[PDB]
Amino acid sequence: HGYVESPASRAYQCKLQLNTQCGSVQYEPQSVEGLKGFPQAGPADGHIASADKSTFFELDQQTPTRWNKLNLKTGPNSFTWKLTARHSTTSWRYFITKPNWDASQPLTRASFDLTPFCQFNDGGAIPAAQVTHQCNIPADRSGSHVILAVWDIADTANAFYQAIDVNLSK
């Protein structure tokens, strides 16, 4: 269990009350857990941000103004997870929406570039309670986008899904 605390994920911003009417996830942003195997398997289209758990379906809403967006620059960024339970880990992956994705429609695999812009494969090692990855957000993205951070667990069928709402500039 864990969440991306910086830049604050959509679920974490629900706990901080930067996002409103998120439902149960406000009280458990670390628990956005579904099956691993994304994108070949994993949470169904339209239900990625919720990890396809019905109680988190508020996170599957998508309008241009629904979610509070962090104003980030492209290029070097840092993504920091807070882990409330440090599970044997397969990988951490970071995906970003395609340049011409539609912020008014549900998030699907077609919304995202399915090649993650960076990936860290831990080989089952136990991570620390705070994990930070440094990657370059692609420069060809501008304006409103969603970054999907995915944590694949090595010794279960599960993964944690952390959508992050961003507004990108040079």
Which residue ranges make up the site for Cu ion (CB under 5 A)?
Answer: 1, 85
- Residue of 62, 63, 6 whose CA lies nearest to 29: 6
Burial code of 40-55, b = ≥16 C-beta within 10 A, e = fewer? eebbeebbbbbbbbee
From the DSSP assignment, how many helices (H) and strands (E) are in the chain? 1, 9
Cβ closer to Cu ion: 112 or 160? 160
In angstroms, give the least distance from the CB of 38 to Cu ion: 17
Q: What is the DSSP string of 42-63?
A: SSPTT-TTTTT-GGGGGGG---
Cis peptide before 127 (omega within 30 of 0): no
Cβ closer to Cu ion: 17 or 84? 84
Q: Which residue is nearest to Cu ion (CB)?
A: 1
In angstroms, give the least distance from the CB of 29 to Cu ion: 12
Cβ closer to Cu ion: 13 or 30? 30
In angstroms, give the least distance from the CB of 153 to Cu ion: 7
Cβ closer to Cu ion: 96 or 159? 159
Cβ closer to Cu ion: 140 or 155? 155
Q: Listing from the earlier edge strand, what are the strands of the sheet with 130-137? A: 2-6, 75-83, 130-137
In angstroms, give the least distance from the CB of 129 to Cu ion: 12
The angle formed by the CA atoms of residues 58, 106 and 61, to the nearest 5 degrees, is 20
In angstroms, give the least distance from the CB of 85 to Cu ion: 4
